[PDB]
């Protein structure tokens with residue numbers, strides 16, 4: 441199992457909003473900056489959010505992040521078929537002195 | 551301790567070449583695609599290499615990857631002051647059925 445907990449899968453239709461939860465502890469998500477990235481087999485992995493809610497240059501505002509307490513969420517509005525991919529949250533764990541990641545959420549566009 | 555083993559730090563002067571090694575086992579690097587990303591605290595993390603040796607769109611060719619047997623290496627030619635960051639390797643680990651990552655390499659440009 442993963443140190444950070446994500447749902448294995450999420451699905452919605454084009455144009456709809458999806459959110460992906462990521463649950464942790466005070467040692468990791470509670471006290472530390474959360475990042476998110478996506479990877480679909482065959483294409484490059486790409487970071488979408490960092491420092492909880494900031495977007496790399498080139499990521500559109502359809503993507504956003506919110507962290508409160510020991511949970512972080514990635515929101516995707518205007519869902520596009522090109523958003524199909526595995527999505528992962530990650531953060532530093534102060535107790536383990538190590539980066540930890542969620543186990544991944546497969547996003548299916550219906 | 552991290553599943554994949556990287557040197558803790560490397561250092562070189564601007565213009566020089568640096569290589570950063572990443573070592574695993576047949577369960578991970580030996581039979582799975584390796585990716586690399588960089589994170590300089592305060593800036594967006596970014597993927598540099600995936601599927602052993604492919605560059606994401608937007609990454610210039612002075613970054614390269616090589617993987618042979620149970621080890622993988624990242625190369626950076628024409629080192630720039632802007633290349634200061636922490637560099638991580640990652641792969642699928644077939645015995646964990648999970649992604650695993652190296653502990654990170656801090657790169658200082660002297």
Ligand SMILES: [Zn+2]
Nearest residue numbers: 479480485526
């Ligand atoms: Zn992946």
Ligand SMILES: [Zn+2]
Nearest residue numbers: 588589590595
């Ligand atoms: Zn980082």
Ligand SMILES: [Zn+2]
Nearest residue numbers: 591636654656
């Ligand atoms: Zn560091």
